[PDB]
């Protein structure tokens, strides 16, 4: 039931942490951040060329966080991979090892601070986010077998709540072609080879045999199926990993208490959505959009919903209307009790969102930040 003694499960729409020995059943809430860079060639979380890692953690935590999502790619996971671009004068603690260890160690330090960790299979390649959980030179079986391996080492770390099966399933072409052309993910279309809802069942089942104590995080797709997407005005405008409109009629076939739907959502910085325009309704049009794209999955369906990645900067690195966006969003999450989230990113170098911070990998965006603590409150 659990090697660790800690069993994670979903009750109602709340994530519970259950100490199987003592019997304590504790509802937990995830106030997290995305510590990216493990889905990269540098093979390490970023910003370490300017600072020490626990300072990052300590700094993280002290800001009020209890969980971090660690994006990774296939190589980061296999033994001999070497990171790159780090300043050892600052971090001389880890000597000679597999981005897997700095990784393992990062997880270790996080738990001492009582921080939970969500493992995310971000990229098969260390370059970009493929639209599918397989490629010409990398098969689904290779993907699943890799998730199994990852479910073994990292399975033992008590603060690891589960697996984000695949980071941002999406399309690389537009509908109606995208639906039946096989280059992109779908949901409720029919073909088990592109339907993420069926693939998620196959991958998740494999993961639960090895880590039955874990939670299965299933993100949305970009497009699902013509009938579903055409049912809502902004149906064709959801984010990669942000379309959960097909959950009602095409629920992933996995035990309800192990399943967590994890949509991704963003503002003006990442991509200039059309409903972001005052002409259409920004920003008061936002509640109904979030609702339709994924909100109803918890509010109406009763499933556990965790925002796996959202972020940007109420700010200047670029666009201002992002201020109104991140505001209206946190307001919204509070009104509806969406208290489990993962900010993107704690890394200032997200050319489209920066971290929760600033490039001298030192200071945090005060206002961008004061807005987010409200939720943790």
Ligand X SMILES: OC[C@H]1O[C@@H](O[C@H]2[C@H](O)[C@@H](O)[C@H](O[C@H]3[C@H](O)[C@@H](O)[C@H](O[C@H]4[C@H](O)[C@@H](O)[C@H](O)O[C@@H]4CO)O[C@@H]3CO)O[C@@H]2CO)[C@H](O)[C@@H](O)[C@@H]1O
Contact residues toward ligand X (CB under 6 A) are: 36, 39, 71, 168, 237-242, 264, 266, 270-271, 349-352
> The tokens of 265 are what?
């959502």
Q: By C-beta, is 10 or 307 nearer to ligand X?
A: 307
Task: Tell me the closest approach of the beta carbon of residue 343 to ligand X, in angstroms.
Answer: 12
What's the rounded Cα separation, in Å, for the pair 302 and 104? 34
Token pair 């942490």 in the structure block, residue: 17
Task: Tell me the closest approach of the beta carbon of residue 218 to ligand X, in angstroms.
Answer: 16
Q: By C-beta, is 152 or 316 nearer to ligand X?
A: 316
> The tokens of 290 are what?
């979030």
What's the rounded Cα separation, in Å, for the pair 257 and 214? 10
Q: By C-beta, is 111 or 125 nearer to ligand X?
A: 125
Task: Tell me the closest approach of the beta carbon of residue 268 to ligand X, in angstroms.
Answer: 12
Q: By C-beta, is 4 or 171 nearer to ligand X?
A: 171
Q: By C-beta, is 82 or 174 nearer to ligand X?
A: 174
Task: Tell me the closest approach of the beta carbon of residue 97 to ligand X, in angstroms.
Answer: 22
Q: By C-beta, is 230 or 257 nearer to ligand X?
A: 230
Q: In what order do the strands lie in the sheet with 307-310?
A: 304-305, 259-261, 215-218, 160-164, 116-123, 67-73, 31-34, 341-343, 307-310
Residue 283, preceding bond cis, omega within 30 degrees?
yes
Secondary structure (3-state) at 125: coil
Task: Tell me the closest approach of the beta carbon of residue 30 to ligand X, in angstroms.
Answer: 19
Q: By C-beta, is 168 or 229 nearer to ligand X?
A: 168
Q: By C-beta, is 23 or 351 nearer to ligand X?
A: 351
Token pair 């106030």 in the structure block, residue: 31
What's the rounded Cα separation, in Å, for the pair 222 and 241? 6
Task: Tell me the closest approach of the beta carbon of residue 49 to ligand X, in angstroms.
Answer: 13
Q: By C-beta, is 240 or 365 nearer to ligand X?
A: 240
Secondary structure (3-state) at 373: helix
What's the rounded Cα separation, in Å, for the pair 342 and 118? 10
Q: Please state whether 49 falls in left (phi above 0), alpha (psi between -120 and 50) or beta.
A: alpha
> The tokens of 344 are what?
């993107």
Task: Tell me the closest approach of the beta carbon of residue 156 to ligand X, in angstroms.
Answer: 26
User: Do residues 361 and 50 touch, judged by C-beta distance below 8 A?
Assistant: yes
Task: Tell me the closest approach of the beta carbon of residue 7 to ligand X, in angstroms.
Answer: 31
What's the rounded Cα separation, in Å, for the pair 270 and 274? 13
Helical residues (DSSP H) of 80-225, grouped into ranges: 100-112, 140-153, 177-180, 196-210
Buried b (16+ CB within 10 A) or exposed e, 237-255: bbbbbbbbbbbeebbbebe
User: Do residues 270 and 315 touch, judged by C-beta distance below 8 A?
Assistant: no
DSSP assignment letter at 359: T
Task: Tell me the closest approach of the beta carbon of residue 4 to ligand X, in angstroms.
Answer: 29
> The tokens of 157 are what?
């770390």
Secondary structure (3-state) at 51: coil
Task: Tell me the closest approach of the beta carbon of residue 168 to ligand X, in angstroms.
Answer: 6
């Amino acid at each position: 039931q659990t090697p660790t003694g800690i069993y994670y499960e979903v009750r109602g729409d709340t994530i519970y942490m259950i100490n199987v020995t003592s019997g304590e059943e504790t509802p937990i809430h995830l106030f997290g951040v995305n510590w990216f860079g493990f889905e990269t060639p540098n093979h390490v979380v970023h910003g370490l060329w300017k600072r020490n890692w626990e300072d990052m953690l300590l700094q993280i935590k002290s800001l009020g966080f209890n969980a971090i999502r660690l994006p990774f790619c296939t190589e980061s996971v296999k033994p001999g991979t070497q990171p790159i671009g780090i300043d050892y004068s600052k971090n001389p603690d880890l000597r000679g090892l597999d981005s897997l260890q700095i990784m393992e160690k990062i997880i270790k330090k996080a738990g001492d601070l009582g921080i939970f960790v969500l493992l995310d299979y971000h990229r098969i390649g260390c370059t970009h986010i493929e639209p599918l959980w397989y490629t010409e030179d990398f098969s689904e079986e290779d993907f699943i077998n890799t998730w199994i391996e990852v479910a073994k080492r990292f399975g033992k770390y008590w603060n690891v709540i589960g697996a984000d099966l695949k980071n941002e399933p999406h399309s690389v072409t537009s509908p109606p072609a995208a639906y039946t052309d096989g280059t992109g993910a779908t949901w409720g279309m029919g073909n088990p080879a592109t339907d993420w809802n069926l693939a998620a069942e196959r991958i998740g089942k494999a993961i639960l045999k090895v880590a039955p104590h874990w939670l299965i995080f299933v993100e949305g797709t970009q497009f699902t199926n013509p009938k579903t997407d055409s049912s809502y005005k902004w149906g064709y405008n959801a984010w990669w990993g942000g379309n959960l409109m097909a959950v009602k009629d095409y629920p992933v076939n996995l035990p309800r208490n192990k399943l967590v739907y994890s949509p991704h959502v963003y503002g003006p910085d990442v991509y200039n959505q059309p409903y972001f325009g005052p002409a259409k309704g920004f920003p008061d049009n936002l509640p109904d959009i979030w609702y339709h794209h994924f909100g109803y999955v918890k509010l109406e369906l009763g499933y556990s919903v965790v925002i796996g990645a959202f972020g940007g900067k109420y700010g200047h690195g670029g666009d201002p209307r992002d201020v109104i966006w991140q505001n209206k969003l946190v307001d919204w999450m509070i009104e509806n009790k969406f208290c489990d989230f993962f900010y993107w990113s704690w890394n200032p170098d997200s050319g489209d969102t920066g971290g929760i911070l600033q490039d001298d990998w030192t200071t945090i965006w005060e206002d961008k930040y004061n807005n987010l603590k409200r939720l943790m409150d």
